[PDB]
Amino acid sequence: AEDYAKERYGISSMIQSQEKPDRVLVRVRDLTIQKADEVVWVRARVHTSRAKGKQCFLVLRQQQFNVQALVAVGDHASKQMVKFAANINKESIVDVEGVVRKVNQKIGSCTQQDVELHVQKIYVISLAEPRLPLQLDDAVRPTVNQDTRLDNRVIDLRTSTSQAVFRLQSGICHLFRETLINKGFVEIQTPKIQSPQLYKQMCICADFEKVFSIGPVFLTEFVGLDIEMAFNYHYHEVMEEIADTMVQIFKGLQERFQTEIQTVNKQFPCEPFKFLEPTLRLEYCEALAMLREAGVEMGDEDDLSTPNEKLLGHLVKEKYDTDFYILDKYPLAVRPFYTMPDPRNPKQSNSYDMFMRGEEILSGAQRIHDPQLLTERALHHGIDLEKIKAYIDSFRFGAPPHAGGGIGLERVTMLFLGLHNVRQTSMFPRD
Amino acid sequence: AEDYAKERYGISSMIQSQEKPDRVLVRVRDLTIQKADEVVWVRARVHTSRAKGKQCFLVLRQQQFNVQALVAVGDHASKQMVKFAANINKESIVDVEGVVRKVNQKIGSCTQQDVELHVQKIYVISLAEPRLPLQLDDAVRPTVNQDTRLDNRVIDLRTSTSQAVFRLQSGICHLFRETLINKGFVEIQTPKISPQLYKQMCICADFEKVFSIGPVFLTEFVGLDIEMAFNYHYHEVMEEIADTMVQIFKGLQERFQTEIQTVNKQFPCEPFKFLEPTLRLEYCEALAMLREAGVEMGDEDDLSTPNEKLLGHLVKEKYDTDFYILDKYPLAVRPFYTMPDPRNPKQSNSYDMFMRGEEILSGAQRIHDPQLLTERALHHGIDLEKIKAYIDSFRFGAPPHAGGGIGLERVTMLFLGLHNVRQTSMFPRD
């Protein structure tokens, strides 16, 4: 009845844009010592809460960042307000007005360690229902299984790890596009109703020259970042561009996303990703030699098995101190019909895979731009020419020599951070 | 022994990466007066050619740009070489070596008008078959039907108009992402087995500012989508969306002028107009405007297409803009997730945006409250059972949020004043 702090708290009216307050909401991550003794408004989630005596301690979380808030009986809060605060369901969103105060000793369990928020006002703007299916702290500790997490995506995506993973994942897309655009590339929009490659090659035959696409690829669905490029005389022109683009991504991530890399590292310990400048390139023959030295028995025209890729990747990592490299000149026999044969060594092909942490992320080649040869290769592979006639015909009115290849975003995210399986890098996994 | 030019021209071996020549191939766009009297190597398409006497003129095309080249009996080329050049099938790709020469009359049929290429060497690196299904000059004149042009896509995409259209379209995507990212957005990848559900999940998962680009749906177009938590009023988002479009329009007009002109030539279009900041009109104001024009409309009626088109014309005449916002549509014509106006309950916190009198975006503040969402869903006669998981995502705290999306082809088409969306779709299927 009496309570003096009544106007300073509670659950507020649903936000329906009835007003535009004159008010600045500061980000948790900007609660530093620079703001000491300033009054601020903060919107955050109630991560957790504890109360004793005349005090309520809260952890206020904004994504990756979190801060301590204290509600204490005095000039601002009544004991009624303290109690209200202590009872706010976890994951509720609150608007808090408080003074930023320096603390004598660092608040070790928060990202904002040098200050705390002394609450003068606190309103629940969105009340969470009491039954949390998942606890955020559980979800991030190095227990919560694949199942509940995948069942409760909205909750799991809130964790500092999840935020880090997908913010970085968006960083990969951004970096890929920007690098490609600055190299003169044009983004294209492939339909899905005839796999991304057919269209990219069409665009090359249509004078596009440098193209990329980013989109669903398919009963599994994933996200492919695809490159196709006309070149002057040698496919190494394209191979090198692709490798350099990967390198710009790794550079950019380590320069701009260090905070998220360190966040994921806290849950899933991983050595920083290593790469050379320029990229290491090895020929198939050298790989065969290395594997044989390790006592692996392999034919000169065999494909690399997964276990052998992993070993070679370990060998390369030991020998060259790199997690990223290109393997070039695969046997023509293991590659797809549209693959250009090697002109010096006719057993081999103008084709390449690239690997991260000993796992294949890209499989490209110089394509065959000549109708006759393409047809000849297709015949050798037993392909019915009738069902690929439209594809072959697209090269008959002049086509430039070209090459390309693509990556899977989730895959590249998983390997860069050294995660357990792609599911850990798919926002909406199935299943 | 008659042909002195034998080594200078011919059909070259198939490019199979058998060599890395020390050779720089210069872009046709770079052939200018600045390069006069330089020897250069150029790779290009034989767009057209003509021959008489001791001379062969070719138009060498490298995408949007083209240059005139001259093979002529002299120190380098023989009669034989001239004859060979004269017989290269159109659309073949050639590697040409030649000197850049200042010409005194503008070569007004080319983009490179100040210079021509005096050929010293010419090789076909890719020989085109003889009978083209489609002539490129026909497909760009204010002639070729939509029909042969969809059958022979690879050829059609080659026209200076297709090049300009799709280069600019890629530029739209770029500017859309870039602006949003600078405003702090995160790109998300939504599955296709619509993005709205998923965008709202991310907002409920504390991502705050998400966008997605990808296929939308029995037709498929490309969607550029935004969703954004805000502080107190959905105008915070509406403004961010409108401003993103402003950044797109500006960047196109700054950086894609030659491609805008290329399309203008084939399909005349007044330059696209917009205000800074974006014009916003409320529903009531639009009704008043339409009534003055003699249209009869109920207060809670949805804007018909003919009525949008008229309204667009009216705002163009009065405010001099091709882009505007209409705010506060009636609640009854909007989707169940649309938040009602807290002040006028017949209206809603919803908006459409228009380019040249046609709708490109339809957004609202969404309902981030489980109870109200459910009510509203009931009102719309939706089975709560089949949207259960959607509602359930708002049960654990959600911020107030708004969003809206555009169609890429549609926005390209309306910016350029084009006739239909097929013109702006790279791979159409009827």
Numbering used by the authors:
A (entry chain A): 21 to 162, 173 to 223, 248 to 272, 283 to 495
B (entry chain B): 21 to 162, 173 to 223, 249 to 272, 283 to 495
Q: What's the paper's own text on this?
A:
In this study, we present the crystal structure of human cytosolic DRS at 2.25 Å. We show that DRS forms a homodimer with the N-terminal extension, anticodon-binding domain, hinge region, and catalytic domain. DRS contains a homodimer in the asymmetric unit and the dimer interface area is 3750.5 Å2 which comprises 16.6% of the monomeric surface area calculated from Protein Interfaces, Surfaces, and Assemblies service. Our crystal structure includes all the Class II AARS domains: anticodon-binding domain, hinge region, and catalytic domain. In addition, the N-terminal extension, which is a distinct domain in mammalian DRS, could be partially modeled including the C-terminal three residues of the characteristic helix motif [Fig. 1(A)]. The anticodon-binding domain of DRS (residues, 57–146) adopts the oligonucleotide binding-fold (OB-fold) that is composed of a five-stranded antiparallel β-sheet connected by helices and loops (β1–β5) to form a closed β-barrel. The catalytic domain (residues, 189–497) contains 13 α-helices (αH–αT) and 8 β-strands (β6–β13) which constitute all the three conventional Class II AARS motifs: Motifs 1, 2, and 3.2 The hinge region (residues, 156–188) plays an essential role in the connection of the anticodon-binding domain and the catalytic domain. In the middle of the hinge region, residues 163–172 could not be modeled owing to the lack of the electron density and the disordered residues are considered as a part of binding region to the ribose-phosphate backbone in the D-stem of tRNAAsp, compared with the known S. cerevisiae DRS–tRNAAsp complex structure. In addition, residues 224–247 in the flipping loop and residues 273–282 in the Motif 2 could not be observed in our crystal structure [Fig. 1(B)]. Thus, we suggest that the phosphorylation of Ser146 could initiate a conformation change of the DRS dimer and trigger an unpredicted function of DRS by releasing it from the MSC.
